[PDB]
Every structure is written in structure tokens, then in C-alpha cells.
Amino acid sequence: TYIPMSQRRSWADVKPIMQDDGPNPVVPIMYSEEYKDAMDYFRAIAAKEEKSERALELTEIIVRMNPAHYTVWQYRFSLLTSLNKSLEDELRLMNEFAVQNLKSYQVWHHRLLLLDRISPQDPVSEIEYIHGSLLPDPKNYHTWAYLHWLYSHFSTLGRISEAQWGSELDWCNEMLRVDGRNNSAWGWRWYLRVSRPGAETSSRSLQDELIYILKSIHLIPHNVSAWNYLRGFLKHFSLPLVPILPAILPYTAFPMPSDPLPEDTPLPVPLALEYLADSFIEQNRVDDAAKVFEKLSSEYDQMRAGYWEFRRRECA
Amino acid sequence: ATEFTPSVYSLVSKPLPSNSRPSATLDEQAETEDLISQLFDLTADPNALVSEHGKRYSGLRKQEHTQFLASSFFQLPGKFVSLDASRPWLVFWTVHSLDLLGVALDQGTKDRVVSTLLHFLSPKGGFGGGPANSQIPHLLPTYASVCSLAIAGNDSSTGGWKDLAAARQSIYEFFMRCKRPDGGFVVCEGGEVDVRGTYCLLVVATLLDIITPELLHNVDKFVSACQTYEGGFACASFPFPEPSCRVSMAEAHGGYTSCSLNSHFLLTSVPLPSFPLSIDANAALRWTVLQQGEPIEGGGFRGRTNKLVDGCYSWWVGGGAPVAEELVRREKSRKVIPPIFNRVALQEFTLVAAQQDPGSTGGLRDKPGKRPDQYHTCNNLSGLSIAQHKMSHSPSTVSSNRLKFDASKGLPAVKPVAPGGGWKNEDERQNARREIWANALGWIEEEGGEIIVGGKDNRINTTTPVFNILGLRLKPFINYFYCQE
Numbered sequence: 001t002y003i004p005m006s007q008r009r010s011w012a013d014v015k016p017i018m019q020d021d022g023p024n025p026v027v028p029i030m031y032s033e034e035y036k037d038a039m040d041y042f043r044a045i046a047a048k049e050e051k052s053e054r055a056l057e058l059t060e061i062i063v064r065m066n067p068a069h070y071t072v073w074q075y076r077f078s079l080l081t082s083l084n085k086s087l088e089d090e091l092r093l094m095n096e097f098a099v100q101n102l103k104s105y106q107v108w109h110h111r112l113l114l115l116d117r118i119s120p121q122d123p124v125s126e127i128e129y130i131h132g133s134l135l136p137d138p139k140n141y142h143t144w145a146y147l148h149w150l151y152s153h154f155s156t157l158g159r160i161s162e163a164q165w166g167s168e169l170d171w172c173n174e175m176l177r178v179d180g181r182n183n184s185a186w187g188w189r190w191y192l193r194v195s196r197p198g199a200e201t202s203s204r205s206l207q208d209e210l211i212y213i214l215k216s217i218h219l220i221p222h223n224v225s226a227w228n229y230l231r232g233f234l235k236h237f238s239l240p241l242v243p244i245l246p247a248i249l250p251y252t253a254f255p256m257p258s259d260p261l262p263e264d265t266p267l268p269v270p271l272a273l274e275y276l277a278d279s280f281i282e283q284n285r286v287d288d289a290a291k292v293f294e295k296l297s298s299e300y301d302q303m304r305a306g307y308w309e310f311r312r313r314e315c316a
Numbered sequence: 317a318t319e320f321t322p323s324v325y326s327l328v329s330k331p332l333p334s335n336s337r338p339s340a341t342l343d344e345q346a347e348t349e350d351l352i353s354q355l356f357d358l359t360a361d362p363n364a365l366v367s368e369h370g371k372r373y374s375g376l377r378k379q380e381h382t383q384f385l386a387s388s389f390f391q392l393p394g395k396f397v398s399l400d401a402s403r404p405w406l407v408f409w410t411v412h413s414l415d416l417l418g419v420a421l422d423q424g425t426k427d428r429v430v431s432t433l434l435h436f437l438s439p440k441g442g443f444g445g446g447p448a449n450s451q452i453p454h455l456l457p458t459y460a461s462v463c464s465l466a467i468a469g470n471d472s473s474t475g476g477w478k479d480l481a482a483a484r485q486s487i488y489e490f491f492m493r494c495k496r497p498d499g500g501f502v503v504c505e506g507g508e509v510d511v512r513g514t515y516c517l518l519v520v521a522t523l524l525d526i527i528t529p530e531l532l533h534n535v536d537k538f539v540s541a542c543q544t545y546e547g548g549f550a551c552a553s554f555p556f557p558e559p560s561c562r563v564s565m566a567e568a569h570g571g572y573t574s575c576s577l578n579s580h581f582l583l584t585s586v587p588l589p590s591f592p593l594s595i596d597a598n599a600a601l602r603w604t605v606l607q608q609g610e611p612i613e614g615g616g617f618r619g620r621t622n623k624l625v626d627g628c629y630s631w632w633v634g635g636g637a638p639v640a641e642e643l644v645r646r647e648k649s650r651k652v653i654p655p656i657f658n659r660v661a662l663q664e665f666t667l668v669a670a671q672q673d674p675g676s677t678g679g680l681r682d683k684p685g686k687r688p689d690q691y692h693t694c695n696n697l698s699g700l701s702i703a704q705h706k707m708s709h710s711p712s713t714v715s716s717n718r719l720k721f722d723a724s725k726g727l728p729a730v731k732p733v734a735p736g737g738g739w740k741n742e743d744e745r746q747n748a749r750r751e752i753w754a755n756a757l758g759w760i761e762e763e764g765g766e767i768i769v770g771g772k773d774n775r776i777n778t779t780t781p782v783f784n785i786l787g788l789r790l791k792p793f794i795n796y797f798y799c800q801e
């Protein structure tokens with residue numbers, strides 16, 4: 001049996017405040033006895049701006065019922081800073097939240113605020129937590145976003161060593177080994193190899209990157225992630241397509257495709273034809289480019305008939 | 317008109333090739349390919365005259381979807397407490413869905429919608445996900461509330477628009493409190509920075525005539541730095557220390573690509589110098605079109621590369637298509653017509669795959685095997701609207717709008733937070749007011765551009781790109797706040 005807070009001696013001094021819905025509201029939720037009671041007392045606590053242990057206790061009770069309650073999380077963080085609570089303990093509590101499947105974006109934002117405030121000299125333990133969190137859920141968009149923020153924030157403080165960057169690339173390569181179609185891991189690779197301020201972008205560095213990309217294409221020729229990365233890479237560094245063309249050409253009819261091609265690889269690969277088309281435009285061969293665009297439109301990628309026709313008309 | 321938009325039924329459905337490397341992605345993809353294609357096989361081709369015997373009819377089940385929305389409109393079970401911070405969205409998804417379905421609310425029910433939403437308005441500025449005495453203001457429910465008031469409200473004393481007009485200064489101040497120096501906004505106090513917040517803020521600020529130079533500083537750079545190597549946009553960008561460079565923080569994603577493209581589009585009507593910083597429009601269009609699924613997955617959209625198609629991306633990705641197309645058109649004109657995505661196949665996804673099975677709860681869904689909900693109902697219908705109609709931003713209409721604009725009419729100007737944060741003078745403010753208003757009302761329905769797959773009984777109303785409310789809602793609403801009635 002639930003004991004109402006209006007009967008508890010710990011809360012005797014507090015007068016609860018009802019939700020101010022106005023008359024006959026639309027989309028009302030049939031709040032449970034527990035949730036309504038807790039919110040009634042939170043309304044009172046927050047209105048008087050009480051910073052206390054019982055207030056902290058109450059916010060945990062509410063977020064456990066509704067992890068997506070952004071207002072209550074805001075108040076919780078204020079309570080943590082006012083009461084000068086252990087932020088390390090709070091982090092461990094967030095770990096317990098994930099184990100108990102109490103997950104939502106607000107939990108992840110809370111983690112960011114905690115780590116920003118703790119501001120540890122070495123964020124490795126949190127990096128590890130994120131990796132472990134990504135293993136059974138490898139495409140969690142905001143976990144990936146958080147990982148980007150963490151390395152980015154802590155790097156501006158000069159707290160990410162070269163060894164740390166190296167093991168991060170090691171970890172990324174393993175994620176891509178496990179699932180070459182994990183576009184989130186391709187994105188992380190782009191941060192690690194191209195976009196981050198400290199990325200090694202010497203001439204031989206670019207060469208090695210091309211080798212990795214092409215090896216990925218030869219492994220999985222229909223991998224849209226791999227093609228997008230290739231196109232994005234060449235564009236960003238303003239590199240000509242023609243020199244790489246021999247590696248791509250077999251997919252239209254430096255590491256080369258395996259002979260024979262892997263089983264279950266019907267030709268042509270649509271994005272391989274896009275490459276050929278764009279390499280013709282590079283050579284100012286607009287007619288030959290229009291011809292492959294037309295082929296994509298009417299034969300080899302008909303779902304995008306209108307788009308490839310548009311690209312064809314852009315030449316003729 | 318359908319020459320470059322083939323039907324799923326006229327194309328060959330084959331699985332995404334494995335290349336003899338199995339992975340977790342392909343396992344999920346193949347299973348989804350099976351779900352969608354088998355449903356298409358059970359369902360009569362919407363384009364057929366001879367709707368063959370025994371097969372499921374794909375007609376838009378408007379009454380079933382109306383019932384679905386009605387059943388949760390006046391009461392929700394206690395298990396839906398997870399949506400307590402999102403009740404304004406429940407309102408928006410419903411009232412907008414009903415608008416698209418062409419089902420009117422009586423005045424009494426509309427008045428309840430207005431009352432409910434106004435109690436979410438806090439005196440300090442902005443709407444929260446619940447009553448002001450229960451929740452703090454937040455950019456997203458502010459968008460949902462404002463748009464809902466455009467849909468269900470009016471210009472009388474009980475209409476709610478009056479209250480928004482009076483709230484203009486406080487909402488603007490809330491917006492300014494949300495602002496970060498890099499051009500991003502926090503969604504709420506102590507909250508996350510992302511491009512959805514920007515979108516929601518820019519929509520509201522545009523509609524209510526509260527745009528200032530100080531509000532917009534760096535906002536273009538934040539959005540523009542969200543664009544990834546893939547061509548779509550991430551949720552946010554990171555400023556490395558004014559900033560020496562900005563870096564995208566995640567994958568190109570249907571939702572944030574929509575919000576970014578729309579944000580950028582809204583910024584292009586503000587006549588500030590060297591503003592907004594350009595985006596790569598061609599790459600955004602490329603990414604957009606590439607997210608439309610293969611025939612076997614029903615021609616629906618996915619939200620990111622190598623992920624499953626989802627009904628909701630019909631709005632996020634599909635609704636971004638006309639915006640990307642217009643930006644590409646403008647860039648080509650700055651140097652110096654067939655559909656750009658498969659309009660037919662997208663409607664086919666909606667009718668065949670995204671509807672709840674007939675004779676049940678109704679509503680629209682992510683994909684077969686998923687419970688329908690208000691969110692997917694609204695976003696499926698919004699996307700279907702974009703596919704059904706040919707919406708264009710018309711330079712001649714913008715010109716007509718300029719010629720009819722009355723600068724002597726308007727609401728009091730917002731007082732800026734910083735003394736020099738406003739416009740240089742009254743002339744420049746009025747020119748900005750004109751441009752913002754004229755461009756907001758620039759979207760037209762192209763004559764002869766209509767394609768209604770399965771016949772005219774499937775037709776729903778035309779939604780406006782960028783804003784995602786009906787033109788007939790947008791026009792009198794913005795005209796009220798700019799006093800152009």
C-alpha cells in the first residue's frame with residue numbers, strides 16, 4: 001500500500017500544489033496516485049525553491065517514473081550544485097539507471113553536465129562507459145553525439161593524449177570490422193581522421209585513408225556508407241576522381257576489386273555509376289556523363305528516375 | 317506526370333545485396349524487406365482499375381484515422397506518463413492530422429484546445445510541456461503550442477492569438493536567454509543545444525514578428541556547420557576556440573536535416589549583410605533523394621544511411637525535398653520540370669505499409685509490426701501531403717506580397733536585450749518585416765502538379781513546407797501578427 005505524502009511527518013510542513021490545467025483540458029493523462037502525489041509536492045518544492053535532501057529524494061522518485069521530465073532534471077542538477085553533492089556518486093546512479101533500463105535523452109544530457117562540472121583530468125573511464133554502452137546498441141544516435149562532445153570538449157582542455165586518440169581509432173576500426181554497414185562508426189571515423197582539429201592530414205595520411213576506404217568498398221561493394229565516405233573524402237580534400245577510377249570501373253559494367261567479385265554482387269552498383277558520371281564531368285565529357293545519368297534514371301536506379309534525369313538535364 | 321515517378325508495383329523488388337558479408341545491419345534490413353514486400357503482395361495495386369479479387373484495399377482510411385485520434389484526444393491512460401513533458405506535441409500531432417484529413421473541430425472543442433495550451437504559457441516567456449506551475453518553458457513545445465494555436469485558435473478574445481500578441485516581448489526574451497554565443501540555442505534552461513531548437517525558435521519568431529539582428533547572430537554558422545560529409549545535417553556542431561572552426565557532432569539524420577534546411581530557408585528572408593552563411597544545397601538534395609527506399613522496402617524513406625525505412629521520415633526527409641530543391645534552384649540562378657523524388661512510391665508506402673490494418677484501431681505507423689501513434693500519424697500524413705501536391709516557393713508571389721505589404725501596420729517592436737541589438741533604423745526594420753512576411757507566404761500549389769495515387773478519395777490537404785501547417789492556417793495567422801489582414 002502506498003503511503004500518501006500528506007500523511008508523512010517528513011512532509012507535514014509542505015502544502016501540495018495541484019496541476020493548473022484550467023477547465024476541461026485536452027490530452028489529459030490519467031496520472032497514477034504515486035505520480036500525481038509526487039508532482040503535487042514537487043510543484044510546492046519548486047515554487048518555494050527549496051534546496052534540500054528531501055527535495056533531491058523527490059526528484060529521483062519522479063524521474064524514475066518519468067525519465068523524460070526535463071523540468072525535474074533541471075531542478076535535480078540545481079539541487080546537486082546547491083547541496084554540494086558528490087557528482088561521482090550521481091554518475092554511478094546514472095549507471096544504475098541504464099542497468100535498470102531507465103533510459104532517455106535527459107539521462108545523457110545529465111551525464112554531459114556532470115562530466116563538464118567534474119571536469120576530470122582524464123576522461124578515460126567515461127570513454128570506456130560510452131564504448132560499453134555502444135556495444136549492444138551500436139547505432140544510438142545521441143550516444144554517438146555524446147562521444148563526439150566528450151572528445152571535443154576534453155581535447156580543448158588538452159586532456160586527450162596521442163595514445164588515447166590511437167586507441168580510439170583502434171576501437172573505431174573494430175566497430176567497423178564487426179559491422180561495415182554501421183554508418184555511425186563511419187561518422188566517428190570521419191571525426192577521428194578528417195574533421196577533428198588534431199587529425200593527421202599529411203599527403204601520405206590521405207593515401208592511407210584512400211586505401212582503407214577502397215578496401216571497405218571491395219569488401220562490401222553495395223555499402224552506401226562506404227561510397228558516401230569516399231565521395232565526401234574526395235570532395236573535402238579536392239581530390240580528382242579520375243586517378244581512382246580504375247578501382248571503381250568494374251562495378252559499372254590502389255586496392256583493386258577481388259577477382260572474381262564476391263558472391264551476390266549484381267552489377268552495376270548505382271553509386272559506382274554516379275562516380276563514373278561525375279568523373280566524366282571532371283573531364284568535361286558532358287555527353288558521356290548525361291548518358292550514364294540517363295541509364296541510372298531509366299534502367300539501373302529507377303526509384304530515383306526524376307533525380308537522375310535532373311542531373312542528366314544539368315549537362316545537356 | 318508519372319514518367320519519372322514509377323510505381324513500386326511496376327519495378328523489380330530485390331533484397332539489398334549481401335556481397336557475402338553478413339552483418340547486424342543486413343539481418344535487420346532483410347527482415348524489414350520481408351515485412352514490407354509481403355504486405356505489398358497482399359495489397360491491391362492502388363494504381364489499378366481492376367482492383368483484383370481477394371487482395372487488401374489500400375484506400376486512405378480517413379474515418380479510422382479520425383477515430384484513432386479522437387480516442388486519445390480527451391483521455392490517455394496512466395502508462396503514457398512518459399509523454400507528460402510532451403503534451404503540446406500530442407495536441408499538434410492531432411489538430412494538424414485532422415486538418416490534413418479535412419475533419420473540422422467544433423468551436424467548443426477548439427476553445428478547449430486554446431485553454432489547454434494557454435495554461436502552458438509562462439509569464440516569463442514560452443510554452444512548456446505542461447501547465448506553467450508544473451513545467452518550465454522549452455523551445456519545442458513552444459513550436460507545438462504556437463502552431464496548434466494557428467490551427468485551432470482565432471482572433472476573438474477567447475481565440476488565443478490575442479494572448480500570443482501580448483506575450484511577444486516575453487517569448488522574445490525567453491529566446492534570448494536560450495541563445496549561446498556560437499549561434500546555437502539551449503532548448504530550455506540548463507538544457508541541450510541542438511538544431512531542432514533553432515528550427516522551432518525560428519518558426520515562432522517568424523510567425524510573431526519578433527526577429528532581431530541580435531537573435532540571429534551566428535545562428536546561420538551553427539546550422540551550416542551541422543552539415544556532414546554525407547550531405548545531410550547532424551543535431552549540433554561544436555565550436556573549437558571567435559571559433560577557430562566548427563565541427564558536426566553526429567550523422568546526417570532525417571529529423572535534423574529537415575530542421576536545418578528549414579532553419580536555413582527561414583534565415584534567407586532576413587536581409588542582413590553576408591547572411592546567412594551558405595550551405596551545400598546540392599549535397600543536401602543528393603542525401604535527401606538517396607534516403608528514399610528501394611522498391612522491396614516500399615519506397616518509403618529512411619532517416620540515415622544503412623538504417624530501416626520509417627513512415628515518419630516521409631515528412632522529415634520528403635518535406636525537406638522542396639526546400640533543398642528551391643535552394644539548388646537559387647544557386648544555379650546565381651551563376652546563370654520532373655519531380656526530384658519518387659512522389660508516387662512514397663504515397664504507396666503511406667497507403668500500403670504505414671496504415672494500421674483495416675477494421676481495427678486505425679492510425680498510421682513507423683512500419684508494419686509497430687503500434688500506430690499520434691507522432692507517426694501526423695508525420696505520415698504530412699509527408700503524404702508533400703508527395704500528393706507540388707509545393708513551390710514562387711518568386712512572383714513573393715513579389716506580389718511585397719507590393720501589397722503595409723509597413724504602417726504592425727505590432728509594437730520587441731525591445732532588444734542589448735542596446736545595439738535591434739535594427740539600425742525603422743526603414744531597415746520595415747524592409748526586414750516585409751521580406752520575412754512576403755517570403756513566409758511565398759509557397760504555392762503548382763497548377764497541374766497534383767498526383768493523387770489511388771484516386772481523389774485519397775486526397776488530403778496541402779501542408780506548407782518549412783512550417784508544416786496548412787496554407788489556410790498560415791495566412792490569416794501570420795497576417796494577424798504583422799497586421800496585414
Ligand SMILES: OC[C@@H]1O[C@@](CO)(O[C@H]2O[C@H](CO)[C@@H](O)[C@@H](O)[C@@H]2O)[C@@H](O)[C@@H]1O
Pocket residue numbers: 266267268299300301302327328329330331332333610611612
Ligand atoms: O539485379 C541487378 C538489377 O536489378 C535492378 C532492376 O532491374 O534493380 C533491382 O535490384 C536491385 C538489387 O539487385 C535493387 O537495388 C532493387 O532496388 C531493384 O529494384 C537494376 O537496378 C539492376 O541492374
Ligand SMILES: OC[C@@H]1O[C@@](CO)(O[C@H]2O[C@H](CO)[C@@H](O)[C@@H](O)[C@@H]2O)[C@@H](O)[C@H]1O
Pocket residue numbers: 317318362363364365766767768769770771772
Ligand atoms: O495523374 C493525375 C491524377 O489522375 C487521377 C485521376 O484523376 O488518378 C489517376 O492517376 C493516379 C496516379 O497516377 C493513379 O494512382 C490512378 O489509378 C488514377 O486513377 C488523380 O486522382 C490524379 O491526381
Ligand SMILES: OC[C@@H]1O[C@@](CO)(O[C@H]2O[C@H](CO)[C@@H](O)[C@H](O)C2O)[C@@H](O)[C@H]1O
Pocket residue numbers: 046047049074075078452453505
Ligand atoms: O532549478 C532551480 C532554479 O532555477 C532558477 C534559475 O536558475 O529558477 C528557475 O527555476 C524555477 C523552478 O523550476 C522556475 O520558476 C524557472 O524556470 C526559474 O526561473 C533558480 O531560481 C533556481 O532555484
Ligand SMILES: O=S(=O)(O)C[C@@H](O)CNC1CCCCC1
Pocket residue numbers: 376377378379380381675
Ligand atoms: O474509410 S474508413 O475505412 O476509414 C471507414 C470504414 O471502414 C467504415 N466502413 C463501414 C462498414 C459498414 C458499412 C458502412 C461502411
Ligand SMILES: O=S(=O)(O)C[C@@H](O)CNC1CCCCC1
Pocket residue numbers: 375770771772773774
Ligand atoms: O479519382 S476519381 O475521383 O476519378 C475516383 C475515386 O475517387 C474513386 N474512389 C473510390 C470510390 C469507391 C470506393 C473506394 C474509393
Ligand SMILES: O=S(=O)(O)C[C@H](O)CNC1CCCCC1
Pocket residue numbers: 042043046047071438439440441448449450451452
Ligand atoms: O516563471 S514565471 O515567473 O512566469 C511563473 C513561475 O514561477 C513558474 N515556476 C514553476 C514552478 C514549479 C515548477 C515549474 C516552474
Ligand SMILES: [Zn+2]
Pocket residue numbers: 626627628629682692
Ligand atoms: Zn518513426
